[PDB]
Design a protein around this ligand. Sequence first.
Ligand SMILES: CCCCCCCCCCCCCCCCCC(=O)OC[C@H](COP(=O)(O)OCCN)OC(=O)CCCCCCCCCCCCCCCCC
Ligand SMILES: CCCCCCCCCCCCCCCCCC(=O)OC[C@H](COP(=O)(O)OCCN)OC(=O)CCCCCCCCCCCCCCCCC
Ligand SMILES: CCCCCCCCCCCCCCCCCC(=O)OC[C@H](COP(=O)(O)OCCN)OC(=O)CCCCCCCCCCCCCCCCC
Ligand SMILES: CCCCCCCCCCCCCCCCCC(=O)OC[C@H](COP(=O)(O)OCCN)OC(=O)CCCCCCCCCCCCCCCCC
Ligand SMILES: CCCCCCCCCCCCO[C@@H]1O[C@H](CO)[C@@H](O[C@H]2O[C@H](CO)[C@@H](O)[C@H](O)[C@H]2O)[C@H](O)[C@H]1O
Ligand SMILES: CCCCCCCCCCCCO[C@@H]1O[C@H](CO)[C@@H](O[C@H]2O[C@H](CO)[C@@H](O)[C@H](O)[C@H]2O)[C@H](O)[C@H]1O
Ligand SMILES: CCCCCCCCCCCCO[C@@H]1O[C@H](CO)[C@@H](O[C@H]2O[C@H](CO)[C@@H](O)[C@H](O)[C@H]2O)[C@H](O)[C@H]1O
Ligand SMILES: CCCCCCCCCCCCO[C@@H]1O[C@H](CO)[C@@H](O[C@H]2O[C@H](CO)[C@@H](O)[C@H](O)[C@H]2O)[C@H](O)[C@H]1O
Ligand SMILES: CCCCCCCCCCCCO[C@@H]1O[C@H](CO)[C@@H](O[C@H]2O[C@H](CO)[C@@H](O)[C@H](O)[C@H]2O)[C@H](O)[C@H]1O
Ligand SMILES: CCCCCCCCCCCCO[C@@H]1O[C@H](CO)[C@@H](O[C@H]2O[C@H](CO)[C@@H](O)[C@H](O)[C@H]2O)[C@H](O)[C@H]1O
Ligand SMILES: N=C(N)NC(=N)NCCc1ccc(I)c(Cl)c1
Lengths: 347, 140, 174, 171, 115, 98, 113, 97
Amino acid sequence: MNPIIFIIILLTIMLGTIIVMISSHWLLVWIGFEMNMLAIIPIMMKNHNPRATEASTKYFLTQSTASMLLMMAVIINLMFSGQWTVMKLFNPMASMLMTMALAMKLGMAPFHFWVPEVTQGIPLSSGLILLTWQKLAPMSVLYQIFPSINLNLILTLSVLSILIGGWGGLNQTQLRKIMAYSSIAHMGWMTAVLPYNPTMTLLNLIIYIIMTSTMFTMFMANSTTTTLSLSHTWNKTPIMTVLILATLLSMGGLPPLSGFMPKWMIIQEMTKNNSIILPTFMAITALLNLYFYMRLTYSTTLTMFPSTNNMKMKWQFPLMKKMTFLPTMVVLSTMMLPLTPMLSVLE
Amino acid sequence: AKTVLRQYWDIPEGTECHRKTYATTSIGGAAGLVVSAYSVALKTPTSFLEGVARTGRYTFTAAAIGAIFGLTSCISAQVREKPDDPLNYLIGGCAGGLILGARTRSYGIGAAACAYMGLTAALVKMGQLEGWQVFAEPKV
Amino acid sequence: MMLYIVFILSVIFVMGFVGFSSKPSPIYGGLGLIVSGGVGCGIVLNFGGSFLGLMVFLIYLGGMMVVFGYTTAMATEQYPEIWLSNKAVLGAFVTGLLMEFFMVYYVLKDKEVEVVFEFNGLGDWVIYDTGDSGFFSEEAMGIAALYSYGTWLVIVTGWSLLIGVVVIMEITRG
Amino acid sequence: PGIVELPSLEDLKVQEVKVSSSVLKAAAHHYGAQCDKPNKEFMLCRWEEKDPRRCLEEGKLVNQCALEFFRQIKRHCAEPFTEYWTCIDYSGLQLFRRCRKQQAQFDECVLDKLGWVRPDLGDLSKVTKVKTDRPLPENPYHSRARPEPNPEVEGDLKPARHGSRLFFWTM
Amino acid sequence: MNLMLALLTNFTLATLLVIIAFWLPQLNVYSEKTSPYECGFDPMGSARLPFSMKFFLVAITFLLFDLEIALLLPLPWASQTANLNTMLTMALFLIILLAVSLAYEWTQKGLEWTE
Amino acid sequence: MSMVYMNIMMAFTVSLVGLLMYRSHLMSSLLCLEGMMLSLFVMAALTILNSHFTLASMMPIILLVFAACEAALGLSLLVMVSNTYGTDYVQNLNLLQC
Amino acid sequence: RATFQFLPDEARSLPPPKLTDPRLAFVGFLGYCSGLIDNAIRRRPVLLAGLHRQLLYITSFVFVGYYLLKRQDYMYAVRDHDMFSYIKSHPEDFPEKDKKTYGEVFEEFHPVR
Amino acid sequence: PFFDVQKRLGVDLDRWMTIQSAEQPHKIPSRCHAFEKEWIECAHGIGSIRAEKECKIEFEDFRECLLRQKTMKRLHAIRRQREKLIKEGKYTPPPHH
Ligand SMILES: CCCCCCCCCCCCCCCCCC(=O)OC[C@H](COP(=O)(O)OCCN)OC(=O)CCCCCCCCCCCCCCCCC
Ligand SMILES: CCCCCCCCCCCCCCCCCC(=O)OC[C@H](COP(=O)(O)OCCN)OC(=O)CCCCCCCCCCCCCCCCC
Ligand SMILES: CCCCCCCCCCCCCCCCCC(=O)OC[C@H](COP(=O)(O)OCCN)OC(=O)CCCCCCCCCCCCCCCCC
Ligand SMILES: CCCCCCCCCCCCCCCCCC(=O)OC[C@H](COP(=O)(O)OCCN)OC(=O)CCCCCCCCCCCCCCCCC
Ligand SMILES: CCCCCCCCCCCCO[C@@H]1O[C@H](CO)[C@@H](O[C@H]2O[C@H](CO)[C@@H](O)[C@H](O)[C@H]2O)[C@H](O)[C@H]1O
Ligand SMILES: CCCCCCCCCCCCO[C@@H]1O[C@H](CO)[C@@H](O[C@H]2O[C@H](CO)[C@@H](O)[C@H](O)[C@H]2O)[C@H](O)[C@H]1O
Ligand SMILES: CCCCCCCCCCCCO[C@@H]1O[C@H](CO)[C@@H](O[C@H]2O[C@H](CO)[C@@H](O)[C@H](O)[C@H]2O)[C@H](O)[C@H]1O
Ligand SMILES: CCCCCCCCCCCCO[C@@H]1O[C@H](CO)[C@@H](O[C@H]2O[C@H](CO)[C@@H](O)[C@H](O)[C@H]2O)[C@H](O)[C@H]1O
Ligand SMILES: CCCCCCCCCCCCO[C@@H]1O[C@H](CO)[C@@H](O[C@H]2O[C@H](CO)[C@@H](O)[C@H](O)[C@H]2O)[C@H](O)[C@H]1O
Ligand SMILES: CCCCCCCCCCCCO[C@@H]1O[C@H](CO)[C@@H](O[C@H]2O[C@H](CO)[C@@H](O)[C@H](O)[C@H]2O)[C@H](O)[C@H]1O
Ligand SMILES: N=C(N)NC(=N)NCCc1ccc(I)c(Cl)c1
C-alpha cells in the first residue's frame, strides 16, 4: 500500500463514521456505515496472508448482513411514519431489527463470534481501529434511538455480552483474542446503562477507548501478540511492564484507577432506577475480566519469566516505534479518578 | 415466555399443583429446547438421528428439573400451609438440582446444583413478594 | 384477473427468490435472480416508476453477467447442482414454494390473510392515487433532483465509488 | 369519527362543456383571455378552501362562462374554427406548429368579429390578482388547538450550589 | 396489455419453431453421435473444470462503472432544473471522479490482464 | 397492509434465511446478499412511489449504488479466497478458530 | 443550551475557574507525569531530559483542562437552573411540609439488652 | 444527529429529504402532505414524551393516510356484505356501478 493511499483510506474510515454521527437522515446513516465498511477491509487485508483473508471475509459477511437488517428497519420505519429523521423509531419490529443490526455491528453476544476471530487475523494497528474507532458509529445511533428500544432485548444483550466476554477471555493465550473478549465484556456495560442514562454510555465508551488504545499501543511498541512473547518485556523495557500493570489493573476496574470510574457511575444510575440485582450481577461477573487481566500482570510484571540468549542483542537498540500519545493515554487510563465530576462535560 | 410465566404466577402458591407443574414443565422444556438448538447449531451432530438424541436428552433433563421444582414447591406449600414462604422454593430449587445431578451421574454437580438452584429459586420468591425488579423500567 | 397484476408478479418475485435462496449451483442462482429482477422491474413499473424499474433490471443484468464469469472461474464443480440434484437444495426449494403457495391460497380465499402480520387481499389497486394530470413524470422529477437537491448525496456516492476502485485494487493485489 | 358530508346529486348538476380535447386546445389561448375572471376566481377558491365541496358554485360559473365563450365562436366563426381544431385533432401529439395556417384564419376571424386578441407568449402563465367577496377561510386544515409549549426556563445563571455535589467532591 | 401481448407473441413464436424443429425431423440417436465435440478426439477432463478469468479486475470495475451510468442517465432531466449552477457542477464533478478512478486503475496496471 | 407487501417482505425473509443458512459455495451466499438488496429496493420503491414522496424517488437509486460497492467488495474477497484454496468453499476459512 | 456549542454564550455570566483551582493544579500535575513517562519509555534521563518537552506537556494539559473545567462548571450551573425553575413551575409537586419537633413525633424504642 | 454540525454551520446536508412535506421539485405534494404537516406542527417543540399523547389524534390520522388500514378494512367489509346478498339473491347492483 502506497502511503498516500493508506492515508486516503484511513480518512475514509473516519469520514464514514463522521457521516453517521452528523446525519439527520436514515439513508445517510446507512451510507456512512457502508462507506466505513468499504474502507476498513483493505486495512484488514494489508498484510495479505490467509488469516487476513479469512478475517476480512468473516468481517465483510457480518457487517454486510447487519446493514441489510439496518436498511430493513429504516424502510419499515418509513412505511409506518413516512419520514427518515434519525430519532426514535415508530414501529416495534423496526426497533428490534435495528437493535439487532447494531448489536452485530458492535459484536455483542450472541452475535459476538466474529470479534475474537477477526481481531486475531489482522495486525495490531488494524485491531486497534476495529475495537475502538469502529464502536463510535453504532453507539452514536443507539444514543439517538434508545427511547424506542425494547428494554428486555437491550438488557439481555448486555447481560450475555458481559458473561460471554468474561468467560471467553479465560481460555485465551493470544493477546488479540484477549482484547477481543475484553471488548465484548465492556460493550455490555455501555448498553446496560443506555436505557437509563445515555450520558453514562458515552463515559464508558470514552474511557474504554483510552484504555484499549493504551494497551494496543504498548503491544505494538514491542511487537508482541502472545502471552509468552509479552513475558519477555521485563528484559527489554522494564518501564513498559509497569505501564501495562497499571493499565491492566485499570481495565479491571480497581480503585483508585480510572477504569473504576465507569463501573461506578453505571452502578449509580442503575440503582437510582431501582435496578439492584442487575448491577450486582454485572459487577461480580466483571471479576472474570479482572482474573485474566491479573494473569497477564503476573506473566508480564509481577514475575520474571525465562528469557532467551538472543534477547541480549535487543539490549543494544532503542525503541523506534512511534508510540503516538502513549505517555498521555497511559496517564489518562490510570490517574483520572479524582476528576470524575468532569463527566458533566458529556452531558 | 411471558404467557407461560404469567400462568404460573396467576394460580396461588400451594393451590392446584398439577397446573403449577405444567407451567414449570413448560418453562423447563422450552429452556431445554433453546439449549439443544444452539448446541446442535454450533456443535454439529454426526447424524440426524444423534442430533435428535441430543435434543431429547437436553429437553427431558430441562423439563424434569422444571416439573420437580413445580411439584416440590407447590406440595411443600400445601402440606406446610405456608403459601407465601420463600422456603418452599428453596425445597423445590434443591430438588431440581438433585434431578440435574442424577441425570449427569455426578454427585458433585448434584450437590452444587441443589445449593445454587436452591438459593436462586428462594431468591426469586422473595423478589416476587417484595417487587424486586431485574429489568427495571427507567424512571429517573 | 388483470387487476391482480402486481400480485401475480410478486408471486413470481418470491419464486425467483426461493430459486437462488435454496442455493443450487450459482449458475442457476443467477438465473433465479434475473427472473426476480425482471419481474421486480415489472412490479415497480406498475406503481408508476418506469425509470426505477428499468434501471434495477439493467443493473442486475450487468451484475449477474459478472457473477456468471466468476462462477465458471471460481465457483464450479464437476457436477453443478440443480434444484432436483441435491436433497438439501430440494427440501429448501419445496419448503419455499409450499409456504408461498399457502400464503397465496389463503389470502385469495379470504381477501385477507394473517401471516404473522395482517395483510389485506382486496387487490393492490385500491391504494392508488385517483387524480393525476401533470405534464411530467413525478418519478423523473424526483430522480433528476439528485443533481440540484442531492449535492451531499452526489459527493458521498461519487467519493464511495472512487474509493471502491482504489479498494478492490488493494484487496486483490496479493 | 363522523359522516362525510357530500352534496346531493341534484347539487352537482350543470350543463357540461362536451367538446373534445382538440377543440379545447384549439380555443385554449382565446379561452384563457376571455374567461380569465371566473376561472381565476375558481382557482383561488380551490387553493384557499382545499375542498372541492366548498367551491361548487364557483365551478358552475366556470362552466357557464365556457359555454358562453363557445357559443360566441359558434355564432360568428364556426367554419374557420372547425377547420382549425380539425387540423389539431389529426396530430397524435395535438401540436400547434402543424396548423399555423388554419390558426391564422381562426385568429383573424375572431379578431375581426369579436375583437379577440391572442395572448402573447408568457401571458397565460402570469400570476394574477383576483378580487373576491368570499371571506378568507379561518382554519382550512381544520386544525385542533396546538399543545402549549413547555414552560420556558429563564433567570440569571448562578453557580451550582456547592458545586457538582457528586458524592464527596467539594467542587 | 399491448406490451404483454407483444412479448408473449414473440416468445411463443420462438417456442413453436423449436417444437417443430424437434418433432418434424427424423432422429437417429446413438452414443457416439451425442458425444461432446472436440475436433475428433475425446475431451480430456470435464468442461465444468474451473476456467481462469484473466480480466477479473476489469470485471469488478465494470460493476462500479455500470452503476455510474445509472447516476448519469438522469442528466437529460436534471438539465431542466432552474438551479443550473449546482446541477452543472455536480454533473461535471461525478464524471471527473469517474475519469479519475479510470486513470487510477489504468496507471496502476489494473486494466492489464493477468498472465 | 396491501397484499403486495406480503410477498416483498416474504422475499426479503427468504433471502435473509438463504443468507444465514450457508452451504459450501461462497458465491451462493453473495447471491443471497444481492437478492436481499433487490427486495429492499422494490420495497422502498413501492412506498415512495405510492406516497408521492417526490424527493425520495432518488433514494432507491442510491441504494443500488452501494449495493454494487458491496457486491464488488464481496467478489474481491472471493478472488482472494479462491486463490488461496482453489475453491470458494467456506469450510476452508476455519483457520481462526485457533 | 446552544446546539453543538462547547461553551454557550450564557456560560460567560458564570465566574471562570481560578488559575489556582485545585482541580487545575491536578491536571497540570498529570501533564508533568506524562512528560516523565515520555522520557522513561524513550530511555532518556527522566527528570532532566527535554525540559522544553516537559513544559509543553504541563502547558497543554492545563490549557485543555481549563476549558473542560469551565464547561464542567457550566453544566452543573445549568442543571441547578433547570431544577429550581421546574420546582417553581410545579409548586403542588414540591409542597412545604409542616415540620414536627421530636417531642411530638412518636419513634419506637428498640432496647439493646 | 449525534453531533449537530449542520445546525452549527447552518448547512443543509440531508434534512431536505427527511419529511415528505418539505419543499419538493415543482411543488409536487405528497399524498399525505396535510396529515404530516398537521402532525409535525402539533408535536413541534414539546418533545416526544408529550407528543406521544398530546398529538395522538394527528398521528393516528397521518398513519391512516399512510397505510389506509382502516379504509381497507371498511371496504373489505362492504365488499363482503355485497357477495353475501348476491348469492342470497337480495341485491342487484345499479347500472352505473
Ligand atoms: C494520583 C491519584 C490517582 C491514583 C491512581 C494511581 C496513580 C498511579 C498511576 C501509575 C501510572 C503508571 C506509571 C508508573 C510509573 C512507574 C515508574 C517505575 O516503575 O520505574 C521505572 C522502572 C523502569 O526501569 P528503567 O526505566 O529501565 O530504570 C532503570 C531500572 N531498570 O521500573 C522498573 O524498573 C520496575 C521493574 C520491576 C517491576 C516492579 C513492579 C512492581 C512495582 C509497580 C509499582 C507501580 C504500580 C502502579 C499501579 C497503581 C498503583 C496504585
Ligand atoms: C489525587 C491525590 C490523592 C492521592 C491518593 C488517591 C486517593 C483516591 C483518589 C480517588 C479520588 C479521591 C479524591 C478525593 C478528593 C476529591 C474531593 C476534593 O478534594 O474536593 C474537590 C477538590 C478541591 O479541594 P478543596 O476541598 O476545595 O481544598 C482546596 C485546597 N486548596 O478539587 C478536586 O477534586 C481536585 C483535587 C484532587 C486531589 C489531587 C489534587 C490536589 C492538588 C495537588 C496537585 C499537585 C500539585 C503539585 C504539582 C507537583 C509537580 C511535581
Ligand atoms: C508532589 C509529587 C508527589 C509524587 C506523587 C507521585 C504519584 C505517581 C506519579 C506517577 C508518575 C511518575 C513518573 C513516571 C515514572 C517515571 C520515573 C521512572 O521511570 O523511573 C524513575 C526515574 C529515576 O530513574 P531513571 O530511569 O534512571 O531516570 C533518571 C532520572 N533521575 O525518575 C525518578 O527519578 C523518579 C520519578 C518518580 C518515580 C515514580 C515511581 C512510581 C510511582 C508510582 C506508584 C504509585 C504512586 C503512588 C500512588 C498514590 C498517588 C498519590
Ligand atoms: C480530561 C482532563 C485532563 C486533560 C487531558 C489533556 C490531554 C490533551 C492535551 C494534549 C495532550 C498531548 C500533549 C503532548 C505535549 C508534548 C508535545 C511536545 O513536547 O512535542 C515536542 C516536539 C514536538 O513539538 P512541536 O510539534 O514542534 O510543537 C508545535 C506543535 N504544533 O517533539 C517531540 O519530541 C514530541 C514527541 C512526544 C509526543 C508524543 C507524540 C505526539 C506528537 C505531538 C506533536 C506535538 C503536539 C503539540 C501539542 C499541543 C497541544 C495543545
Ligand atoms: C421454574 C422453571 C425451572 C426451569 C429449569 C431449567 C433448568 C435449566 C436446564 C438447562 C438445559 C439442561 O442443561 C444441560 O443438561 C444436560 C443433561 O444431560 C447436560 O449434559 C451433560 O450431562 C449428560 C451426561 O453427561 C449428557 O446430557 C451430556 O453428555 C453432558 O454434557 C448439559 O451439560 C447441560 O447443559
Ligand atoms: C445465579 C444467580 C443469578 C441471579 C439470581 C437473582 C435472583 C433475582 C430474583 C428475580 C426477581 C424476582 O422475580 C420476579 O419478581 C416479580 C416482581 O417484581 C414477579 O412479578 C410478578 O408479580 C405478580 C404478583 O404480584 C404476578 O402475578 C406476575 O405474574 C408478575 O408480574 C415475577 O413473577 C418474578 O419472576
Ligand atoms: C411459474 C408459476 C407461476 C405461479 C403464478 C401464481 C399466480 C397467483 C394466482 C393469482 C390468481 C388471482 O385470481 C384472481 O382472484 C380474483 C378474486 O376476486 C378474481 O376476481 C374475481 O372478482 C369478482 C368478485 O366480485 C368475481 O365476480 C370475478 O368473477 C372474479 O374475477 C379473478 O378472476 C382472479 O383472476
Ligand atoms: C475531482 C473534483 C472535480 C470538481 C470539478 C468541478 C468543475 C465545476 C466547473 C464549474 C461548472 C459550472 O460553472 C458555472 O455554471 C453556472 C451555470 O451553469 C454559470 O452561471 C451562469 O449561468 C447561470 C444560469 O445558467 C447564471 O445564474 C449565472 O449568472 C451565470 O454566470 C457560471 O458562470 C459557471 O461558472
Ligand atoms: C475527463 C475525462 C477525459 C480525461 C481522460 C481521463 C482518462 C485518463 C486515462 C489515464 C491517463 C494517464 O494514465 C495512463 O498511464 C499509463 C501508464 O501505465 C499510460 O499507458 C501506457 O501503457 C499502456 C499500455 O501499453 C498504453 O496506454 C500506453 O502505451 C502507455 O501510455 C497511459 O498513456 C496513461 O494515459
Ligand atoms: C429478521 C426478521 C426478518 C423478517 C422481517 C419481516 C419484516 C415485516 C415488517 C412488518 C411490520 C408490521 O408491523 C406491525 O404492524 C401491525 C399493524 O397491524 C401493528 O399492530 C399493532 O399496532 C397498530 C397500531 O399501532 C394496531 O394494529 C394495533 O395497535 C396493533 O395490532 C404492529 O404494532 C406492528 O409491529
Ligand atoms: N438520564 C438521562 N437519560 N438524562 C439525564 N442525564 N437526565 C438527568 C438530568 C441532568 C443531569 C445532569 C445535568 I449537568 C443536566 Cl443538565 C441534566
